[PDB]
Amino acid sequence: GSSGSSGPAAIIKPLEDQWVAPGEDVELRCELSRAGTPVHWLKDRKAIRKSQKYDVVCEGTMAMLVIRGASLKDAGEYTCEVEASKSTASLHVEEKASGPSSG
């Protein structure tokens, strides 16, 4: 007997490649077939931990990740490892022509 009407929490709306500058805030939102589900943010094959830098905002079937001050390094492959689903993306970060320095 299968109780509770069918309804998984897989990811239907995968992330995408973001293009920002070295010092701006990045927000990676997503969509889940259900709310109240745990997520796993993997950056460069590394397990991330919710903190001042990474603000895991899990709202109505929406998982957003704020990357305060995203430096050229912050750029990496973000893998949203959900219950069973999974989403992969590539972050970008390049300095602007007009700034404190160029190179």
PDB file of C-alpha atoms in Angstrom:
ATOM      1  CA  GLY A   1       0.000   0.000   0.000  1.00  0.00           C
ATOM      2  CA  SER A   2       1.389   3.351  -1.118  1.00  0.00           C
ATOM      3  CA  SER A   3       0.080   6.108   1.152  1.00  0.00           C
ATOM      4  CA  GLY A   4       0.349   9.825   0.453  1.00  0.00           C
ATOM      5  CA  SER A   5      -0.615  10.866  -3.069  1.00  0.00           C
ATOM      6  CA  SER A   6       2.331  10.541  -5.455  1.00  0.00           C
ATOM      7  CA  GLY A   7       4.554  13.609  -5.604  1.00  0.00           C
ATOM      8  CA  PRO A   8       8.373  13.521  -5.582  1.00  0.00           C
ATOM      9  CA  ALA A   9      10.704  16.455  -4.936  1.00  0.00           C
ATOM     10  CA  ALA A  10      12.962  16.056  -7.970  1.00  0.00           C
ATOM     11  CA  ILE A  11      14.369  19.104  -9.754  1.00  0.00           C
ATOM     12  CA  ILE A  12      12.419  20.180 -12.836  1.00  0.00           C
ATOM     13  CA  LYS A  13      14.124  23.532 -13.406  1.00  0.00           C
ATOM     14  CA  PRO A  14      17.911  23.007 -13.580  1.00  0.00           C
ATOM     15  CA  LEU A  15      20.395  25.817 -12.947  1.00  0.00           C
ATOM     16  CA  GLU A  16      22.217  27.739 -15.679  1.00  0.00           C
ATOM     17  CA  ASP A  17      25.557  29.385 -16.454  1.00  0.00           C
ATOM     18  CA  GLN A  18      25.835  32.703 -14.615  1.00  0.00           C
ATOM     19  CA  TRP A  19      28.095  35.574 -15.673  1.00  0.00           C
ATOM     20  CA  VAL A  20      29.126  38.067 -12.992  1.00  0.00           C
ATOM     21  CA  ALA A  21      32.139  40.076 -11.834  1.00  0.00           C
ATOM     22  CA  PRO A  22      34.730  39.396  -9.100  1.00  0.00           C
ATOM     23  CA  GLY A  23      32.942  40.966  -6.148  1.00  0.00           C
ATOM     24  CA  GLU A  24      29.255  40.680  -7.003  1.00  0.00           C
ATOM     25  CA  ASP A  25      26.651  38.451  -5.354  1.00  0.00           C
ATOM     26  CA  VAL A  26      25.516  35.325  -7.202  1.00  0.00           C
ATOM     27  CA  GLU A  27      22.090  33.735  -6.762  1.00  0.00           C
ATOM     28  CA  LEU A  28      21.377  30.256  -8.126  1.00  0.00           C
ATOM     29  CA  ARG A  29      17.660  29.484  -7.886  1.00  0.00           C
ATOM     30  CA  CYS A  30      15.923  26.238  -8.841  1.00  0.00           C
ATOM     31  CA  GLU A  31      12.595  24.395  -8.841  1.00  0.00           C
ATOM     32  CA  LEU A  32      11.453  21.208  -7.107  1.00  0.00           C
ATOM     33  CA  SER A  33       8.381  19.035  -7.663  1.00  0.00           C
ATOM     34  CA  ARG A  34       7.881  19.383  -3.908  1.00  0.00           C
ATOM     35  CA  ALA A  35       8.872  21.655  -1.023  1.00  0.00           C
ATOM     36  CA  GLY A  36      10.545  20.806   2.272  1.00  0.00           C
ATOM     37  CA  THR A  37      13.356  18.810   0.683  1.00  0.00           C
ATOM     38  CA  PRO A  38      17.072  18.688   1.587  1.00  0.00           C
ATOM     39  CA  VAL A  39      19.681  19.877  -0.913  1.00  0.00           C
ATOM     40  CA  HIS A  40      23.427  19.448  -1.417  1.00  0.00           C
ATOM     41  CA  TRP A  41      25.491  22.236  -2.976  1.00  0.00           C
ATOM     42  CA  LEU A  42      28.719  20.854  -4.441  1.00  0.00           C
ATOM     43  CA  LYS A  43      31.299  23.363  -5.675  1.00  0.00           C
ATOM     44  CA  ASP A  44      34.287  21.954  -7.559  1.00  0.00           C
ATOM     45  CA  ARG A  45      33.566  18.445  -6.282  1.00  0.00           C
ATOM     46  CA  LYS A  46      33.540  19.812  -2.733  1.00  0.00           C
ATOM     47  CA  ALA A  47      30.781  19.690  -0.117  1.00  0.00           C
ATOM     48  CA  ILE A  48      29.564  23.175   0.796  1.00  0.00           C
ATOM     49  CA  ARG A  49      28.223  24.231   4.195  1.00  0.00           C
ATOM     50  CA  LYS A  50      25.498  26.831   4.730  1.00  0.00           C
ATOM     51  CA  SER A  51      27.208  29.906   6.175  1.00  0.00           C
ATOM     52  CA  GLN A  52      27.531  33.688   5.927  1.00  0.00           C
ATOM     53  CA  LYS A  53      29.079  33.174   2.491  1.00  0.00           C
ATOM     54  CA  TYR A  54      26.686  30.503   1.225  1.00  0.00           C
ATOM     55  CA  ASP A  55      23.117  31.396   2.188  1.00  0.00           C
ATOM     56  CA  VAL A  56      20.905  28.392   1.448  1.00  0.00           C
ATOM     57  CA  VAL A  57      17.460  29.913   0.910  1.00  0.00           C
ATOM     58  CA  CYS A  58      15.042  26.994   0.602  1.00  0.00           C
ATOM     59  CA  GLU A  59      11.676  28.584  -0.179  1.00  0.00           C
ATOM     60  CA  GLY A  60       8.485  27.334  -1.801  1.00  0.00           C
ATOM     61  CA  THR A  61       9.852  24.624  -4.081  1.00  0.00           C
ATOM     62  CA  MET A  62      12.782  26.974  -4.678  1.00  0.00           C
ATOM     63  CA  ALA A  63      16.427  26.485  -3.711  1.00  0.00           C
ATOM     64  CA  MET A  64      18.552  29.631  -3.933  1.00  0.00           C
ATOM     65  CA  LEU A  65      22.248  29.869  -3.065  1.00  0.00           C
ATOM     66  CA  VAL A  66      23.762  33.279  -2.322  1.00  0.00           C
ATOM     67  CA  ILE A  67      27.517  33.442  -2.893  1.00  0.00           C
ATOM     68  CA  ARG A  68      28.519  36.667  -1.142  1.00  0.00           C
ATOM     69  CA  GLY A  69      31.524  38.239  -2.840  1.00  0.00           C
ATOM     70  CA  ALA A  70      32.084  35.848  -5.734  1.00  0.00           C
ATOM     71  CA  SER A  71      35.773  36.013  -6.648  1.00  0.00           C
ATOM     72  CA  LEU A  72      37.418  34.537  -9.743  1.00  0.00           C
ATOM     73  CA  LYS A  73      37.914  31.442  -7.588  1.00  0.00           C
ATOM     74  CA  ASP A  74      34.265  31.156  -6.552  1.00  0.00           C
ATOM     75  CA  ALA A  75      33.797  30.128 -10.184  1.00  0.00           C
ATOM     76  CA  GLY A  76      33.163  26.395 -10.373  1.00  0.00           C
ATOM     77  CA  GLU A  77      30.762  23.566 -11.173  1.00  0.00           C
ATOM     78  CA  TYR A  78      27.684  23.755  -8.947  1.00  0.00           C
ATOM     79  CA  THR A  79      26.001  20.359  -8.634  1.00  0.00           C
ATOM     80  CA  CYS A  80      22.604  20.454  -6.928  1.00  0.00           C
ATOM     81  CA  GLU A  81      22.427  16.923  -5.528  1.00  0.00           C
ATOM     82  CA  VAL A  82      18.789  16.491  -4.499  1.00  0.00           C
ATOM     83  CA  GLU A  83      16.869  13.481  -3.190  1.00  0.00           C
ATOM     84  CA  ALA A  84      17.202  11.557  -6.454  1.00  0.00           C
ATOM     85  CA  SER A  85      17.446  14.302  -9.077  1.00  0.00           C
ATOM     86  CA  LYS A  86      20.549  16.362  -9.849  1.00  0.00           C
ATOM     87  CA  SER A  87      21.450  19.614 -11.606  1.00  0.00           C
ATOM     88  CA  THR A  88      24.815  20.770 -12.948  1.00  0.00           C
ATOM     89  CA  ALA A  89      25.975  24.239 -13.990  1.00  0.00           C
ATOM     90  CA  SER A  90      29.061  26.379 -14.590  1.00  0.00           C
ATOM     91  CA  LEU A  91      29.671  29.696 -12.830  1.00  0.00           C
ATOM     92  CA  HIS A  92      31.683  32.498 -14.434  1.00  0.00           C
ATOM     93  CA  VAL A  93      33.553  35.477 -12.983  1.00  0.00           C
ATOM     94  CA  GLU A  94      35.632  38.053 -14.855  1.00  0.00           C
ATOM     95  CA  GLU A  95      36.893  41.523 -13.939  1.00  0.00           C
ATOM     96  CA  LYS A  96      35.400  44.544 -15.706  1.00  0.00           C
ATOM     97  CA  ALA A  97      37.390  46.920 -17.910  1.00  0.00           C
ATOM     98  CA  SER A  98      36.632  49.819 -15.568  1.00  0.00           C
ATOM     99  CA  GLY A  99      37.904  49.121 -12.065  1.00  0.00           C
ATOM    100  CA  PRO A 100      40.747  49.404  -9.529  1.00  0.00           C
ATOM    101  CA  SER A 101      42.991  47.398 -11.855  1.00  0.00           C
ATOM    102  CA  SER A 102      43.091  45.358 -15.064  1.00  0.00           C
ATOM    103  CA  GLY A 103      44.876  42.245 -16.286  1.00  0.00           C
TER     104      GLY A 103
END
